[model samples]
Target: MKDKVRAMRSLLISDEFAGLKNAIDRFMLILSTLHRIDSASFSEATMFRVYFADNEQTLLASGQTTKPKAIPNTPFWVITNNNTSRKQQMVEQVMVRMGFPSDIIEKVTHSI
Candidate 1:
């Protein structure tokens, strides 16, 4: 129980996670409005990253090109496209921002 609890408290502050940090910020902006919660609470993490996707896939393919990089740790937040038709995904994105687990995000997002 203790181990699992701490696992969720970790933040990805490595250079590789820099891009996702930005995504979390963007996600929190949209999420806080939905749940009427403080945006800072959810956007906060151990070491979140922020970066734009250059090749969509190949750009951050994790050492698949000349621009080699390391993830350093596991990631929790990720964003690729700005606009999407998948409402469920959007809902889950917001759910995560509200401090909901991935499983709960799926359950809640899918029911909607």
Candidate 2:
């Protein structure tokens, strides 16, 4: 990060460099969010786990099960438009449909 900032410092006057900064900022935010979601399993003892494709850490499949299931050796998604908020919505919706308490959903997603 220090090196990256040094690299960007010289080009700070360029609009393109500003755009690059925004993209890189959001990139790290996504990485941290994924880390939070994955570490919750161990921290809270939930059966949930987040799986990613071998080639893409952003591509994910998160769910709960008794046994430690294997993530498939598969290709990463290249043409996708989903984001963190959308995924949280879907997860909350499923939990609601399955009759999970609203408060619990609130707790689970509160960190993100």
Candidate 3:
């Protein structure tokens, strides 16, 4: 994970967006601090398990790029061509299907 973070940091800082280097540096510092604190837990094994499981779940859900079955029939397709909006709606639908609040659907739609 440390190596992965270092690689990502290099990608971010070495790109043309060097103007955001300070922000990236601060983010790296915060991430490193969190990693250190988490690693120092009394039950580091349990902490690591929980952390990895949560991260894996998040990644799996986020990586599910399939379009919802209902999307083709929705009126949302008529109003705009924003793929971001479509994706946001799909994420909301996925969350709701997973037992989250319907209002989260609205919030995600509006946020994008």
Name the candidate that leads on lDDT: 1
Return the clash pairs for model 2, or none.
Answer: none
State candidate 1's TM-score: 0.28
For model 2, where is the 10-residue window of minimal lDDT? 70-79
For candidate 2, give the lDDT: 0.35
**Candidate 2: regions farther than 4 A off:** 1-80
Summed backbone clashes in each candidate are: 15, 0, 0
Ranking by TM-score: 2, 1, 3
lDDT of candidate 3 over 26-109, digit per residue (tens):
323322322343333312322220112223334334444322121121111111222654445533443344343564335433
lDDT of the candidates, in the order given: 0.37, 0.35, 0.33
Q: Candidate 2: lDDT of 7?
A: 30
lDDT of 1: 0.37
- Residue 76 displacement in candidate 3 (angstroms): 26
1-112, model 2: which lDDT tens digit per residue?
A: 3432233233334454346434323333332332333433222322232333223333333322212222222221121234556445534553354344676555433323
Task: Put down candidate 1 lDDT per residue, 17-72, tens digits, no spaces.
Answer: 33544443434333323323333443452123232122335444533333322221
